[PDB]
Design a binder for this molecule. Sequence first.
Ligand SMILES: CC(C)c1noc(=O)[nH]1
Ligand SMILES: [Mn+2]
Ligand SMILES: [Mn+2]
Lengths: 137, 137
Amino acid sequence: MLSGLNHLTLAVSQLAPSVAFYQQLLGMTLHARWDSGAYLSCGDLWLCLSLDPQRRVTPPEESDYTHYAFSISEADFASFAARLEAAGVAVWKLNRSEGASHYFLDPDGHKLELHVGSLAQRLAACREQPYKGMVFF
Amino acid sequence: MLSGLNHLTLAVSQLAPSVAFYQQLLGMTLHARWDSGAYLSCGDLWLCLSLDPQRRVTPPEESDYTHYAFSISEADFASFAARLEAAGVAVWKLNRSEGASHYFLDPDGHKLELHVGSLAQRLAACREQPYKGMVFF
Ligand SMILES: CC(C)c1noc(=O)[nH]1
Ligand SMILES: [Mn+2]
Ligand SMILES: [Mn+2]
């Protein structure tokens, strides 16, 4: 049986800007780097950056909705988003829902999100105002 | 301060075959489904499947190395991988070895992996046989 997410690997076009983004701007811990990759952690998350000649810097209009959301407390949310805005990090979507989300891009166009709240909270909100066709199990 | 992964959202071209893959084949827990998405969990992982007509199915040879690995125990690894092969799940290939892993594709061409071992175990293995240019912090 599967027990959780083991690691998330992102393909990157250039290692140095990606390490700077994840380690210095986002504050993740850098454990190791080599000529074609790096290992970082963010809480329990193991993140691998893999240098890939096939990776293109992809505008948000040209990629689908696949995205990766990081946990943050409500108290820290606004100052963290403001840090990203000062650094010139692009936003790919406005939050149109209740609850706190900030949608931002990494240097290669991977779609990222800051989100406050758990699955249990989302399910409780949906039980009150379900999406079209929603069934619970 | 970021504290880990909040959720993983995958864009899918057809909801029902994707839900069946993650729930029936991979054994993830289905919490809710609606006309354009589903919420599942795998241990601590919150997985969202989102119906996206912009999702294309690309051969693994022409998509980049971005991929998502799930944890499995040493005792369950070989029999789970054998079950995926017997179900006809397609494989893909990574450029380097990262330990005990099985690489497979989901119905929309997302690159998945079964992996045995933690980041700490990977770092210890790399100390004994490092990648080219490796530095440990
Ligand atoms: C599709 C939408 C309701 C959604 N829920 O979590 C996401 O990441 N997107
Ligand atoms: Mn999201
Ligand atoms: Mn991997």
